[PDB]
Structures are given as structure tokens and as C-alpha cells.
Design a binder for this molecule. Structure first.
Ligand code: FE
Ligand code: FE
Ligand code: FE
Ligand code: FE
Ligand code: FE
Ligand code: FE
Ligand code: FE
Ligand code: FE
Ligand code: FE
Ligand code: FE
Ligand code: FE
Ligand code: FE
Ligand code: FE
Ligand code: FE
Lengths: 161, 161, 161, 161, 161, 161, 161
């Protein structure tokens, strides 16, 4: 099993997943720590969702006789404000699309449809998340940073613990 | 209404399904009768899964105004030891892959995506079964035949009746 | 070990069952596909019943140290109308009675009563089905083909989907 | 009154049942006492099966106005190893088939079908036990004695008490 | 079509059933009327038991393209005391055995096992009812008629109302 | 290892149990067959009671490294009337007392209290069964045999079927 | 007040129990610690059983105005392998039988039956355990040490934590 070009694509996406997991998780802990507890819970969920992706890819790789790469993490764009965090996470998302769109076509050319369908679902998921992040940035401009941030705390406001 | 080439492909796969069902079911009966009753349940489930594929393909053929071929069987490979059975069953699965991979691409070129999607699912499924069979053969080597077989009996060993 | 003439008879019946299963299942899919969904469900159950028979004969053969023949199918007679299907299915059934009636007598001469009882039960089942099939034909003449067929669709008429 | 020859056959089979009951029960206790507790439970069950057979024969005999023989026990052959026990038990099962096969034919010649059916059912039951026993012997050769034996103990191994 | 000789035998037995049904039912009404209400309930059930037999035979006859005879009835022998009733009912039962024993052998000679099995089951049933009747007569002699009769009443004694 | 004298005594008692089991069970089938269905259920239970005794002794013998004797059976005395049956069963019981009383004292002399306690419990049980049997015989004389027998039937009387 | 020789015997047994409790509990912790967690659980229950015995003897002593000796322990024999542990635990057990058997006889001579019955029950318990221990050693020889040990671990193997 396992076409070297497909395996390499899968492993590169896996590296991207482990990056997203760490980045998203930390951001959610920071949001929590700042008092934005309502938002933190949401961001945390996205993190576990990438975990699910990572596992799905790991499985595909193992089935294909490859060795999953758990050694390499990508760069970490840690935001110091809500807006920076949204933008940072958006940036990871666009890169996934840039890589997976052409990747899918190749998988099908290489006659590996199972890998292709896997990546098609991930694209579908990522498009939704990208939309969510872009909508939040639009909301910040429409409402104002303070007003938007107030919708991110509880009543009364709390902290990480 | 359905493309003649797509229909010949579906009928080829259908024939392959009927062959697999008989082979898998008989193997399950033999394993059962040999005393390997735990394993036999697993193989039995596999033949019922193939029946489900046979029905799905039949549906597709009929919808395309084709005639499902229920007259033709391929050559059964009956193993006379556990290892032979895993290897015989493995042989059918690869043929399935070798056939359906070019077939899916063809179906999409003919713009029949519903038939392509049906075969995409079947391929996904067979890959999981191949991995299962290939793994059983690996375990026989790692554990040794006798030790592996002891894991396929109940406590205490039964008989099948 | 089982007597060779008994095993041959058992295997001949097994070939008959596999044929019947295919014929009946295909007929039920066709009936379903024509819109006769109420009838289709009934014919489906008949093919699963022949499955039950196939497994029982397989067990008996295996117990007698025989090798169950799953490689050979008989000739399918596929009907292109309801009446034809009833007549085609009836042809298999009379065929079984013709084979089994002398067969039982012989099984008992060879002092294999357990095989005899198995075949006695199958004969009893087939007589009931033959009666069913003959009654449907009788009803088609009495009601008329149209009126009869109307009793085989749901309200409102539906399809395989 | 019953035919004296049928009555003599029934009493003869009754003696065989009483023998098998003793032999099977003792073996089960010995297996229990050796540490083979999972196997013991199975052999104990077979012992109560023969008890039911013994009762049914007693009934038939009484109905036929004869005297059931509870005075005579056959020759017990008691195994000192598992393999010996399977062989000893199999030996007695073969005698049954040898006595009952011609016996049934004659019952029917004597026009006593109720007695014949009772014996037909017994033959059916013993063929399944013969198969179970022969399969165990076959498993001992395939797995080895120790490995097979270990499938007959509990985890952890225990004792009769 | 059934064999004409088998059909004749079946209709003879049916005539016997209808006779037994009327006789047993009337005897039970008379026993009830005399005050023997406990016994009457038992005899009534025997009467419905023959009804079931009558229906089974009717069914078989119709499946064989025969015409069930519901016009001919046998001669009732109606007892005027408990003992006479038992002796009268026993007389029908023996006639059933005298006719069915040879009948079964013939049915099997004609290739009709289903009719034979039906009759085998009836012989088994009547054998049990004969035993019951014979046992009651033995009890009357052991207990004396007065003492036996007292076991057939309720506490306190009642009537058909 | 148990003391050889204790082992001999245990096997003697076991032989007695097996004799009692057969005799009591047959007597109960005969009582049932005669119509004495209420009494039969009682005798049947006594028979299973001795089975429990037989198993306890077997267990003790095996724990002491002995070989249980399941080959030797005593002489059955089978009664042809109720009174004979009670007298026949009572005769076994007295023999048990005659053997076990001295037996217990010896067991304690040999340092084997567990075997002694087992036998003490059996003596207690048989003493109660002797009382039951002796009481039934006294009742036959007080009531008369006919009147006593009437207490052993159901209302209304039935049979073994 | 209790007899001085009885009290001494009771206290000697109490010292035996405290020793056994320690030895068995430590063995179970060691077995648990080696990975034989299934076996460990069984050995633990045995030490709690000896606790039960220790308390009963304490009660009896106190009732007889004695002073229970909780200051003295016997010599622990700690095994460094499974087989050694079984043999070490067996050594204590034969020791108890040797002490208790003559002891009981004496208790009864001193006319202290309640103390005698207490010791009779302990002897009965120990015989069962001795059988258990002897059977495990017997099974180690039959299966082999490795195969036997494998039956003492969970799936998958685990540890004391
Ligand atoms: Fe992603
Ligand atoms: Fe995402
Ligand atoms: Fe498939
Ligand atoms: Fe599959
Ligand atoms: Fe059939
Ligand atoms: Fe059918
Ligand atoms: Fe038997
Ligand atoms: Fe058996
Ligand atoms: Fe009848
Ligand atoms: Fe009747
Ligand atoms: Fe007893
Ligand atoms: Fe008793
Ligand atoms: Fe103790
Ligand atoms: Fe203990």
C-alpha cells in the first residue's frame, strides 16, 4: 500500500493538525485566563475537533503502511489580543485550504479515493471554521471591541478557576 | 438509461460480491466446525457485510435499467487451514481493489457520480478488511500458529453444535 | 463419515437452494422495482427462508465429513412479468419435490434418519410454498391480472425508494 | 402391550444411558478435581442430557406396559487423562449409533412409530455429541495438549472447592 | 394432487375425528350434568384436542386437492355411567390405532412423508389418551367406584350451573 | 490420602446411594403411571435428595485421593403395590443406618471428622425419611388402603401424561 | 472457666492463624506486584478467611476466661516464586491438620464440644484449601510454569496500579 506522494501529503497535513491543536488549545487557555470564559469554551472545542482530524489522518497513514510524524510542530502564532488570536488562527486555516485543494485532486489522480474523501471532509470542516472566524472579526468592527468582548464573559464575569 | 460500460463494471463487481459471500460463509462454517468458534462469528459477519454490498449494487443496476447478473460465480478458493483461508479471502479483496480503482475514475468521466460514490464506499470498506486479514497473518507469525489459534476458541473449547 | 450417495443428494439439494435463493431475491427486487412493494416484501422473506435451508444442509454435510458445494449454481429462470415469476418459482419447487421424495426413502434405507428428517421438513415447507404460488395464479385468473396487481401495491403506490 | 423386541431394544438403550450418565458424571467430577473447571461444567451438562434421555425411554417403556431395567449398568471405561476421557466417552456414543440405527428400522417394521421417533431424536442428539468430542480430539492435536488444557481452566485457575 | 389412497385414508381418519369430537363433548356435558364437574373439564379438553386434529387433517386434505368429508359421522357409543364412558371412548381410540399404524407405512410407500408425519403425531397423541383412559379404569378397581367418583367432584359438589 | 478403611466405607455408602436413587426414581415413575401423581412427585424428590448425597460422598472421596465407585450397584427390590414400595424403600434406609452408625465412630477414631460429619448429616436425613415411610404404613392401616390411596391422586385423577 | 489444655491448644491455633494471615497477605501483595493480579485477588481472600478464623478462636478463648495470645507469631516462609509460595502456604496447612486432628479428639474427651466443633469446621476449611494448593501445583506440572502463569494475569497484563 501507500503512494509516496499521498503519504507525504497526509504527513504534512498531520503536522498542520498538531500545530493547530497546540495553538488553539493555548489560545483557549489564554482567553479563559483573561476572563473571556464563554469564548474560551468554544475555542477549546475547536482544539479537540482538530484532535479528531489528527487521529483520522494517523489512522489513514498507518493503514497505508506509512509512519505518522509526531515529531514536527509548525510555527506558533500566539495572539496577545482577541483580534490577534482570531487572525492567527485564520492564517492556519487558509494554509490548510491552500494545501488540501490541490492535494485532493492528486489523490484522485493517484486513484486513492479513500484518502481523497478524508481530505474532502476536512476541507468542508475548515471552511465552516474559517467562516466562523471571519464572522467574529466582522462582528468586532460592527459592535466595537469592548461591546463584542462583553458578549464573551459570563454574568457575572469570572476567571479560569 | 445507464451507460453500458458502467453497467458492465457494476455487474462485474456484483459477480465478485456473490463469489465473496459464498467463500466467506463457507469458511465461517468450516472454522466453526473446526472448533474455532470465536473467529467463525467474525468471518460470518464479513459475509453478511458482502451481502449488503451485493444488494446496494443490485439496487444501482436496477435503477439504471440494467439486468443484475445472479447467474455467474467466480472461482472459490477454499482454504483447508486457517492461514490458507486468510490468504484465499485476501486474494478476492485485492482483485476488488484492482478492478474498482480504475472503475471509479471511469464512472466519473461518464458523469455517473452516484455509481462512483457507491464504489468509493465499497473500496473504503475492503481496505479495512484487507488490513484486518493482513494483520491476522502477521499475528500468526508473531505469536505462532498454535498460540494464535488458541485465541480463536472459547473457554472451554466448543465444537460448533 | 456419511454415505456417499446421501452426501451427493445433500449437495444436489444445496445447489438447488442457492439457485432458489438467487432467483427469489432477484424476483423480489424486480417486483419492488416495478412498484409491487407489498408483494416484494413477501417474496424477499421466501428467499431468506431458502437461506435458512441452505445453512441447515451445510451443517448436515459438514457433520458427515462432506464438502459443501458452494461453487455450482443451477439455471436461473427470470420472469419479466408477475405471472412468469410465479411460474418460474414454481418450476424450482416441483423440481425439489421430485428430487427429495425418492431421496428421503433412500436416506432411510441407508439408515441415515437425521438426514431423512431434515429432508422431510424441507419437503413440508416446499409444499406450503407451492400451494401459495398456485393460489396466486388461481387468483390472477379469478380477479384478473390488473385487479390482482392492484392488491400488490401500497396506498398510495410507491417504489423501491 | 409393546412388541417384545421393541421393548428389549428400549431396555437395552436404557442400560446404555445409565452407563453414560455414570461415566459422564464421574468424568466431570474428575475434570473439576483436576482444575479443568470450565470443561467440567460442560461435561456435567452432557450428563444431565443423558438423564433426560433415560427418563423419556423409561416413560415409553412404561406406556408400552413393560418393566424398565434400572438394575443393570454396563462397563464403565474411565479415563485418567483428558484425551482418554474424550475417547472413552466417544466409544460409548458409537455403540449407541450401532444399536439404534438398525433399531429404528425395525421399530417401523413393527409399526411402532412413536418408539421410532424417540430413537430418531436420540440419534440426532448423539451425532452432535460425537462431533463435539471428535472436534476436541482434533483441537488437542492442532493446539497441543498443554495449550488446549489451558483453555479449560479459569483465570486464575481454581479447584472443585 | 395427493395419492387417491392417501386421500381416502385421510378422510377416514377425519370421519373418526368428528365422531370422537361429538362423543367426547357429549360425555363431558353428561359428566358435568351428573355433578362430576372436575372430571368433565378434563374430558371437554380432550374433545377440543380432537378438534385440532380434525383441522390439521382438513388442511392436509385441502392442500392435496382433496375434498374433506364433513358429511359422514360414525356411530356414537354413549355410556350411561362413568365406567361405560371410559370404555366407550377407549374403543374409538383403539380403532384409530388399528387404522393409522398400517396407514403410516403406506403413506411412506407412496412418497408422502408430510401426511405420514401428521399421522405419526396423531398416533403419539392417542397412545397417551389411551393410557389415561386405561389408568382411570385401573383406578376404579383399586379405589372402588364410589371412592373414585368422589375424586371427580368439587368441594362442595356442584352442577352444570 | 484418606485412610483406606474410611475410603472403603465411603464407597460402600456411595453404592447404597446409587441403589436408592434408581429404586426411588423407578418407584416414582410407577406411582405416577398408576395414577398416584400426587404421591409420585414426593417420591421423585426423595430420589433427587439421594443424588445430592451421592455427589457429596463422591466429592469427599475425590478430596481424599480415592476413586469413587460408579460401577457397582445393589439389588433393587421393586414393589408392585404402594405398600410393597414403602416396605422396599424402608429396607434400604435401615441398611444405611446399620452401616453408618458404626461407621461414624470409626471415622472419628481415625482422626477423620469431616467424613464423620458428612455421615452424621446423612444419618439425620435418613432418620427423617424412615419416619415418613413408617408413618405412611401406619396411615394405610388407620385409613385403609383404598382411602389412603385416594389421598394420593389429584382431583380429578390423572396419569403420567 | 475452660480447661487449661484446651485453652493452650486454642492459643496455639491462634498463633498459627496470625502467622498464616501474614504469610498469605504478603504473598498476595507480591503476586499482585509481579503482575499476577488475577491470582493475587484469590490469595487475598484466603488471608481474610484466616482472619475470620482468628476472630472465632479469639471469641472462644475469651468466653472460656482465657487470654488470647496476640503477641506471638510463627516463622514466615516467604516464597520468591509462585511454586514456592504455593509450597510455603501448603506447609502451614499440613501443620494445622497435624495439630488439630488430635486436638479435636481431646476437646471431646475434656467434654468441650463447642470448642471441638469450632476446630472441626476449621479442619474442614483447611482440607479444601490444601486441595486447592495441591491442584495448582499439579496444574503447573501439566500446563508448564509459563502457560500456567499466563492464566494468572489479566488481559492485557496489568499491575498493582
Ligand atoms: Fe484542520
Ligand atoms: Fe479548524
Ligand atoms: Fe465487497
Ligand atoms: Fe467488506
Ligand atoms: Fe427449499
Ligand atoms: Fe420456499
Ligand atoms: Fe444417549
Ligand atoms: Fe451424549
Ligand atoms: Fe384423534
Ligand atoms: Fe383422544
Ligand atoms: Fe442416603
Ligand atoms: Fe432417603
Ligand atoms: Fe485456618
Ligand atoms: Fe485457609
Amino acid at each position: 500500500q501507500g503512494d509516496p506522494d499521498v503519504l507525504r501529503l497526509l504527513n504534512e497535513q498531520l503536522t498542520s493538525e498538531l500545530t493547530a491543536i497546540n495553538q488553539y488549545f493555548l489560545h483557549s487557555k489564554m482567553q479563559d485566563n483573561w476572563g473571556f470564559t464563554e469564548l474560551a469554551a468554544h475555542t477549546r472545542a475547536e482544539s479537540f475537533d482538530e484532535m479528531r482530524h489528527a487521529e483520522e489522518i494517523t489512522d489513514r497513514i498507518l493503514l497505508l503502511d506509512g509512519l505518522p510524524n509526531y515529531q514536527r510542530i509548525g510555527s506558533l502564532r500566539i495572539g496577545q489580543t482577541l483580534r490577534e488570536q482570531f487572525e492567527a488562527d485564520l492564517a492556519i486555516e487558509y494554509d490548510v485550504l491552500n494545501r488540501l485543494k490541490p492535494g485532493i485532486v492528486m489523490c484522485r489522480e493517484k486513484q486513492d479515493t479513500t484518502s481523497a474523501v478524508l481530505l474532502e471532509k476536512i476541507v468542508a470542516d475548515e471552511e465552516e471554521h474559517i467562516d466562523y472566524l471571519e464572522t467574529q472579526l466582522e462582528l468586532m468592527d460592527k459592535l466595537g471591541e469592548e461591546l463584542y468582548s462583553a458578549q464573551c464573559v459570563s454574568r457575572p464575569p469570572t476567571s479560569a478557576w
